[PDB]
PDB file of all heavy atoms in Angstrom:
ATOM      1  N   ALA A 249      15.074 -30.447   8.477  1.00  0.00           N
ATOM      2  CA  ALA A 249      14.823 -31.486   9.468  1.00  0.00           C
ATOM      3  C   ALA A 249      15.141 -32.865   8.898  1.00  0.00           C
ATOM      4  O   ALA A 249      15.868 -33.652   9.514  1.00  0.00           O
ATOM      5  CB  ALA A 249      13.368 -31.407   9.931  1.00  0.00           C
ATOM      6  N   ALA A 250      14.611 -33.160   7.704  1.00  0.00           N
ATOM      7  CA  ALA A 250      14.811 -34.462   7.069  1.00  0.00           C
ATOM      8  C   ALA A 250      16.280 -34.809   6.920  1.00  0.00           C
ATOM      9  O   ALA A 250      16.641 -35.988   6.909  1.00  0.00           O
ATOM     10  CB  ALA A 250      14.150 -34.481   5.691  1.00  0.00           C
ATOM     11  N   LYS A 251      17.145 -33.808   6.804  1.00  0.00           N
ATOM     12  CA  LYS A 251      18.548 -34.053   6.530  1.00  0.00           C
ATOM     13  C   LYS A 251      19.420 -34.034   7.783  1.00  0.00           C
ATOM     14  O   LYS A 251      20.647 -34.142   7.667  1.00  0.00           O
ATOM     15  CB  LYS A 251      19.048 -33.039   5.505  1.00  0.00           C
ATOM     16  CG  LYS A 251      18.175 -32.980   4.275  1.00  0.00           C
ATOM     17  CD  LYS A 251      18.983 -33.170   3.017  1.00  0.00           C
ATOM     18  CE  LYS A 251      18.147 -32.831   1.795  1.00  0.00           C
ATOM     19  NZ  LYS A 251      18.904 -33.039   0.535  1.00  0.00           N
ATOM     20  N   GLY A 252      18.827 -33.907   8.968  1.00  0.00           N
ATOM     21  CA  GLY A 252      19.554 -34.038  10.215  1.00  0.00           C
ATOM     22  C   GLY A 252      20.035 -32.759  10.871  1.00  0.00           C
ATOM     23  O   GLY A 252      21.058 -32.794  11.572  1.00  0.00           O
ATOM     24  N   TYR A 253      19.340 -31.638  10.665  1.00  0.00           N
ATOM     25  CA  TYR A 253      19.678 -30.354  11.261  1.00  0.00           C
ATOM     26  C   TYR A 253      18.543 -29.911  12.171  1.00  0.00           C
ATOM     27  O   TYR A 253      17.381 -30.248  11.936  1.00  0.00           O
ATOM     28  CB  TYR A 253      19.922 -29.278  10.186  1.00  0.00           C
ATOM     29  CG  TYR A 253      20.991 -29.650   9.180  1.00  0.00           C
ATOM     30  CD1 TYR A 253      20.653 -30.141   7.927  1.00  0.00           C
ATOM     31  CD2 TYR A 253      22.341 -29.513   9.482  1.00  0.00           C
ATOM     32  CE1 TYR A 253      21.636 -30.492   6.997  1.00  0.00           C
ATOM     33  CE2 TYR A 253      23.329 -29.861   8.561  1.00  0.00           C
ATOM     34  CZ  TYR A 253      22.968 -30.347   7.316  1.00  0.00           C
ATOM     35  OH  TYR A 253      23.936 -30.689   6.384  1.00  0.00           O
ATOM     36  N   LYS A 254      18.880 -29.155  13.212  1.00  0.00           N
ATOM     37  CA  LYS A 254      17.858 -28.578  14.074  1.00  0.00           C
ATOM     38  C   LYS A 254      17.282 -27.321  13.440  1.00  0.00           C
ATOM     39  O   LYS A 254      17.980 -26.567  12.753  1.00  0.00           O
ATOM     40  CB  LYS A 254      18.424 -28.232  15.452  1.00  0.00           C
ATOM     41  CG  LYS A 254      19.023 -29.410  16.184  1.00  0.00           C
ATOM     42  CD  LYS A 254      20.180 -28.967  17.073  1.00  0.00           C
ATOM     43  CE  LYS A 254      20.926 -30.157  17.655  1.00  0.00           C
ATOM     44  NZ  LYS A 254      20.019 -31.004  18.474  1.00  0.00           N
ATOM     45  N   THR A 255      15.990 -27.102  13.670  1.00  0.00           N
ATOM     46  CA  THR A 255      15.293 -25.910  13.206  1.00  0.00           C
ATOM     47  C   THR A 255      14.670 -25.197  14.398  1.00  0.00           C
ATOM     48  O   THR A 255      14.142 -25.839  15.309  1.00  0.00           O
ATOM     49  CB  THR A 255      14.199 -26.251  12.187  1.00  0.00           C
ATOM     50  OG1 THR A 255      13.248 -27.130  12.798  1.00  0.00           O
ATOM     51  CG2 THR A 255      14.796 -26.921  10.952  1.00  0.00           C
ATOM     52  N   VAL A 256      14.729 -23.867  14.381  1.00  0.00           N
ATOM     53  CA  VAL A 256      14.184 -23.030  15.442  1.00  0.00           C
ATOM     54  C   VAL A 256      13.382 -21.915  14.787  1.00  0.00           C
ATOM     55  O   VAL A 256      13.894 -21.206  13.914  1.00  0.00           O
ATOM     56  CB  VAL A 256      15.293 -22.445  16.344  1.00  0.00           C
ATOM     57  CG1 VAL A 256      14.697 -21.528  17.401  1.00  0.00           C
ATOM     58  CG2 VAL A 256      16.102 -23.557  17.012  1.00  0.00           C
ATOM     59  N   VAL A 257      12.125 -21.771  15.182  1.00  0.00           N
ATOM     60  CA  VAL A 257      11.302 -20.657  14.722  1.00  0.00           C
ATOM     61  C   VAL A 257      11.057 -19.791  15.941  1.00  0.00           C
ATOM     62  O   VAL A 257      10.317 -20.182  16.848  1.00  0.00           O
ATOM     63  CB  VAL A 257       9.993 -21.125  14.070  1.00  0.00           C
ATOM     64  CG1 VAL A 257       9.128 -19.922  13.685  1.00  0.00           C
ATOM     65  CG2 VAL A 257      10.298 -21.961  12.840  1.00  0.00           C
ATOM     66  N   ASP A 258      11.694 -18.625  15.979  1.00  0.00           N
ATOM     67  CA  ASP A 258      11.783 -17.861  17.218  1.00  0.00           C
ATOM     68  C   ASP A 258      12.473 -16.536  16.914  1.00  0.00           C
ATOM     69  O   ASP A 258      12.845 -16.283  15.765  1.00  0.00           O
ATOM     70  CB  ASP A 258      12.543 -18.680  18.278  1.00  0.00           C
ATOM     71  CG  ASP A 258      12.256 -18.235  19.707  1.00  0.00           C
ATOM     72  OD1 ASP A 258      11.582 -17.206  19.915  1.00  0.00           O
ATOM     73  OD2 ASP A 258      12.722 -18.927  20.634  1.00  0.00           O
ATOM     74  N   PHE A 259      12.655 -15.686  17.919  1.00  0.00           N
ATOM     75  CA  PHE A 259      13.324 -14.405  17.698  1.00  0.00           C
ATOM     76  C   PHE A 259      14.784 -14.605  17.303  1.00  0.00           C
ATOM     77  O   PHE A 259      15.504 -15.386  17.928  1.00  0.00           O
ATOM     78  CB  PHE A 259      13.209 -13.536  18.958  1.00  0.00           C
ATOM     79  CG  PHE A 259      11.846 -12.970  19.137  1.00  0.00           C
ATOM     80  CD1 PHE A 259      10.830 -13.746  19.688  1.00  0.00           C
ATOM     81  CD2 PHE A 259      11.543 -11.700  18.670  1.00  0.00           C
ATOM     82  CE1 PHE A 259       9.538 -13.252  19.796  1.00  0.00           C
ATOM     83  CE2 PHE A 259      10.253 -11.191  18.783  1.00  0.00           C
ATOM     84  CZ  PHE A 259       9.250 -11.968  19.349  1.00  0.00           C
ATOM     85  N   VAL A 260      15.214 -13.912  16.256  1.00  0.00           N
ATOM     86  CA  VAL A 260      16.592 -13.960  15.786  1.00  0.00           C
ATOM     87  C   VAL A 260      17.203 -12.574  15.954  1.00  0.00           C
ATOM     88  O   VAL A 260      16.925 -11.663  15.174  1.00  0.00           O
ATOM     89  CB  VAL A 260      16.677 -14.428  14.322  1.00  0.00           C
ATOM     90  CG1 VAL A 260      18.139 -14.442  13.837  1.00  0.00           C
ATOM     91  CG2 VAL A 260      16.031 -15.801  14.166  1.00  0.00           C
ATOM     92  N   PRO A 261      18.041 -12.375  16.970  1.00  0.00           N
ATOM     93  CA  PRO A 261      18.674 -11.062  17.156  1.00  0.00           C
ATOM     94  C   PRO A 261      19.516 -10.664  15.949  1.00  0.00           C
ATOM     95  O   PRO A 261      20.172 -11.499  15.318  1.00  0.00           O
ATOM     96  CB  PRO A 261      19.538 -11.256  18.408  1.00  0.00           C
ATOM     97  CG  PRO A 261      18.894 -12.438  19.140  1.00  0.00           C
ATOM     98  CD  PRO A 261      18.372 -13.328  18.045  1.00  0.00           C
ATOM     99  N   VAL A 262      19.472  -9.368  15.624  1.00  0.00           N
ATOM    100  CA  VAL A 262      20.301  -8.819  14.551  1.00  0.00           C
ATOM    101  C   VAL A 262      21.755  -9.209  14.751  1.00  0.00           C
ATOM    102  O   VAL A 262      22.458  -9.592  13.805  1.00  0.00           O
ATOM    103  CB  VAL A 262      20.135  -7.289  14.492  1.00  0.00           C
ATOM    104  CG1 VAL A 262      21.287  -6.648  13.724  1.00  0.00           C
ATOM    105  CG2 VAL A 262      18.795  -6.951  13.863  1.00  0.00           C
ATOM    106  N   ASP A 263      22.219  -9.148  15.995  1.00  0.00           N
ATOM    107  CA  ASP A 263      23.604  -9.469  16.289  1.00  0.00           C
ATOM    108  C   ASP A 263      23.970 -10.905  15.915  1.00  0.00           C
ATOM    109  O   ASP A 263      25.149 -11.186  15.670  1.00  0.00           O
ATOM    110  CB  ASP A 263      23.857  -9.198  17.771  1.00  0.00           C
ATOM    111  CG  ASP A 263      25.323  -9.283  18.140  1.00  0.00           C
ATOM    112  OD1 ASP A 263      26.123  -8.427  17.673  1.00  0.00           O
ATOM    113  OD2 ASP A 263      25.670 -10.215  18.897  1.00  0.00           O
ATOM    114  N   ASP A 264      22.996 -11.822  15.860  1.00  0.00           N
ATOM    115  CA  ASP A 264      23.309 -13.196  15.461  1.00  0.00           C
ATOM    116  C   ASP A 264      23.677 -13.292  13.992  1.00  0.00           C
ATOM    117  O   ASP A 264      24.404 -14.211  13.602  1.00  0.00           O
ATOM    118  CB  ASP A 264      22.130 -14.126  15.739  1.00  0.00           C
ATOM    119  CG  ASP A 264      21.987 -14.454  17.212  1.00  0.00           C
ATOM    120  OD1 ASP A 264      22.833 -13.988  18.015  1.00  0.00           O
ATOM    121  OD2 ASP A 264      21.030 -15.174  17.566  1.00  0.00           O
ATOM    122  N   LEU A 265      23.167 -12.374  13.166  1.00  0.00           N
ATOM    123  CA  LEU A 265      23.511 -12.363  11.750  1.00  0.00           C
ATOM    124  C   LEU A 265      25.014 -12.275  11.538  1.00  0.00           C
ATOM    125  O   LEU A 265      25.549 -12.868  10.591  1.00  0.00           O
ATOM    126  CB  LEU A 265      22.825 -11.193  11.054  1.00  0.00           C
ATOM    127  CG  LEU A 265      21.312 -11.307  10.962  1.00  0.00           C
ATOM    128  CD1 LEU A 265      20.734 -10.214  10.078  1.00  0.00           C
ATOM    129  CD2 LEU A 265      21.014 -12.623  10.392  1.00  0.00           C
TER     130      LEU A 265
END
Side-chain angles (χ1 to χ4, degrees):
Chain A
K251 308 233 191 181
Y253 304 100
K254 302 148 188 300
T255 60
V256 177
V257 176
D258 201 352
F259 286 81
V260 179
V262 162
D263 189 67
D264 285 358
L265 292 189

